[PDB]
Amino acid sequence: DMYIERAGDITWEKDAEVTGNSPRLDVALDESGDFSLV
Amino acid sequence: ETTDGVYRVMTRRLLGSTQVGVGVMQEGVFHTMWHVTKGAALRSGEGRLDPYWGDVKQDLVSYCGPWKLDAAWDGLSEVQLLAVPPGERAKNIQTLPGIFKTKDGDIGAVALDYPAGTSGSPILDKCGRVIGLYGNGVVIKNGSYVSAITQGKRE
Numbered sequence: 498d499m500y501i502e503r504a505g506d507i508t509w510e511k512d513a514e515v516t517g518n519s520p521r522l523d524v525a526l527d528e529s530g531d532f533s534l535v
Numbered sequence: 536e537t538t539d540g541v542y543r544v545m546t547r548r549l550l551g552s553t554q555v556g557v558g559v560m561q562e563g564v565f566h567t568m569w570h571v572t573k574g575a576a577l578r579s580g581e582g583r584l585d586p587y588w589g590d591v592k593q594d595l596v597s598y599c600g601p602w603k604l605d606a607a608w609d610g611l612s613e614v615q616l617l618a619v620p621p622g623e624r625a626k627n628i629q630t631l632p633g634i635f636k637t638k639d640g641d642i643g644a645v646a647l648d649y650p651a652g653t654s655g656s657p658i659l660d661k662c663g664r665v666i667g668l669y670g671n672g673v674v675i676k677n678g679s680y681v682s683a684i685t686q687g688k689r690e
């Protein structure tokens with residue numbers, strides 16, 4: 498049995514650290530809900 | 536508890552208490568990814584949340600009602616992943632989405648790597664609206680993870 502517990506509000510953080518790049522990928526989505534690269 | 540916000544999804548079928556994912560409560564509906572719960576019933580303290588809508592292909596599921604989140608990446612702005620990693624506090628990470636280009640159209644994607652139990656963490660726009668959930672994506676040449684910004688359809 499799974500249960501849920503609250504972890505915070507849904508809010509923009511002005512003082513957030515910024516990371517991660519922005520790749521453009523060509524992908525396929527199969528019937529099982531999985532993305533694959535092409 | 537049905538207060539709006541971000542929630543951990545926990546199980547005890549394994550060792551100790553394990554976080555299997557994350558979800559968003561909004562307007563009395565709990566939203567998460569299909570692969571987190573596989574459509575299973577959930578417990579909130581003394582109450583019970585049962586599934587209302589789900590789709591494996593989208594990898595989303597809603598509890599107590601229909602999908603309520605309808606905001607979308609404006610295209611241009613940077614976004615924030617409100618990551619809730621297992622055993623760690625909720626943390627905002629700001630990033631500029633990349634793009635998954637499919638035969639069916641383009642989807643924003645975030646190149647951020649978190650443990651599997653972070654699946655379901657909301658991505659938000661600057662005005663605070665949830666524009667999708669994290670945790671369904673690909674692993675690319677270098678070996679790091681890129682998650683789609685996975686959003687449902689309201690009404």
Ligand SMILES: N=C(N)N[C@H]1CCCCNC(=O)[C@H](CCCCN)NC(=O)[C@H](CCCCN)NC(=O)Cc2ccc(cc2)CNC(=O)CCCNC1=O
Pocket residue numbers: 529530531532533534570594648649650651652653654670671672673674678679680
């Ligand atoms: N860094 C990662 N790769 N994952 C992160 C978590 C990813 C975010 C959570 N979301 C998922 O786990 C979904 C659940 C299925 C959604 C249902 N449709 N899975 C995915 O999106 C993709 C889809 C495959 C597409 C190819 N056809 N599956 C994987 O990446 C498997 C995997 C391959 C390699 C590894 C770990 C996992 C290597 N370990 C690590 O690097 C660090 C170990 C811990 N950190 C992780 O595990």
